[PDB]
Every structure is written in structure tokens, then in C-alpha cells.
């Protein structure tokens, strides 16, 4: 009955795993720019607009943001050759694929549209973008609005 994302321990677990995965990037020998850039979601937002946007619009935008992140991560994994960095990007794809399902379990399947996009080239951007999206719109939605979404 109750959605899976509505357990706050799930969001905390996602945050802890994301920050652990970001820190692990320092360990493996080297990182080089992706030969072809990757599209990442619009994480930037202002508190002025957030307090006025309709809840349906917020859910519809955050679902599309996570989906576009997943699409970018899959393209990055497709481009990179077998190596430690590719394994880290696979493990991050696991985080993003968990996050999308957790969000769909509460917000329902709703037709997303792309926002503004930045064609990044640094592989660190994907971990950074995931962490920014998790700290931002995700926790914003699940705390400001959460108690009204989770009942029924």
C-alpha cells in the first residue's frame, strides 16, 4: 500500500550510497574526459519558483530529471571501455535505476518532458549531478510535500 519512497530511511540510504560512490572515484588510477559529451538533467532551481509551481508539475519534472540522468549514465557506460571507471559508472547506474523506481513507486507514471540540459564531459559530473539531484529537488519534494503524497 504505502509507497516505498515514503520511508525516509530509503532516501537516507540513497544519499549515503551516493556520497560513498562519489568518494570512491578518488581511488582508481585515473580519469579522462569522455570523448563525446553526455546530457545531464536540470538540477538548478530557485526557492522563489519552487514555492509556486504546482505539485503535479514538480513530480512530472523530477521524474524526467531522473530519467534523463539514467539515459546519460547508460550512454556513458556504452562509450567507456572496460576498466575500473566503467565499473564505477555501472555501480552508479545501479543507484540511478534504484532512484527512478523508488520515485515511480510514489509519484506514479506521469509523462515527463526534458528541461534545460548541459552537455558535460567530465565523468565526475555524473556522480556530482546525481548527488545534486538527490540533495535538491528529490529531498525537497519528499519533505515539503511528502506527508500529503504518502497516505493514499
Amino acid at each position: 500500500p504505502v509507497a516505498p519512497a515514503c520511508d525516509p530511511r530509503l532516501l537516507n540510504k540513497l544519499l549515503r550510497d551516493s556520497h560513498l560512490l562519489h568518494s570512491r572515484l578518488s581511488q582508481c588510477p585515473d580519469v579522462d574526459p569522455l570523448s563525446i559529451p553526455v546530457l545531464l538533467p536540470a538540477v538548478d532551481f530557485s526557492l522563489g519558483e519552487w514555492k509556486t509551481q504546482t505539485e503535479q508539475s514538480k513530480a512530472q519534472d523530477i521524474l524526467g530529471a531522473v530519467s534523463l540522468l539514467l539515459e546519460g549514465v547508460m550512454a556513458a557506460r556504452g562509450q567507456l571501455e572496460p576498466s575500473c571507471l566503467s565499473s564505477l559508472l555501472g555501480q552508479l547506474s545501479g543507484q540511478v535505476r534504484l532512484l527512478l523506481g523508488a520515485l515511480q513507486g510514489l509519484l506514479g507514471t506521469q509523462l515527463p518532458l526534458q528541461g534545460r540540459t548541459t552537455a558535460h564531459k567530465d565523468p565526475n559530473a555524473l556522480f556530482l549531478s546525481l548527488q545534486q539531484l538527490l540533495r535538491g529537488k528529490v529531498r525537497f519534494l519528499l519533505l515539503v510535500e511528502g506527508p500529503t503524497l504518502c497516505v493514499r
Binding site: 516505498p4 535505476r97 534504484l98 523506481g101
Partner: peptide
């Protein structure tokens, strides 16, 4: 275990 296990889908 790489990507063929997904929890909520």
C-alpha cells in the same frame, strides 16, 4: 548482479 537486479520495477 551488475544491472539485472532492480528493486522496484
Amino acid at each position: 548482479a551488475q544491472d539485472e537486479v532492480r528493486l522496484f520495477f
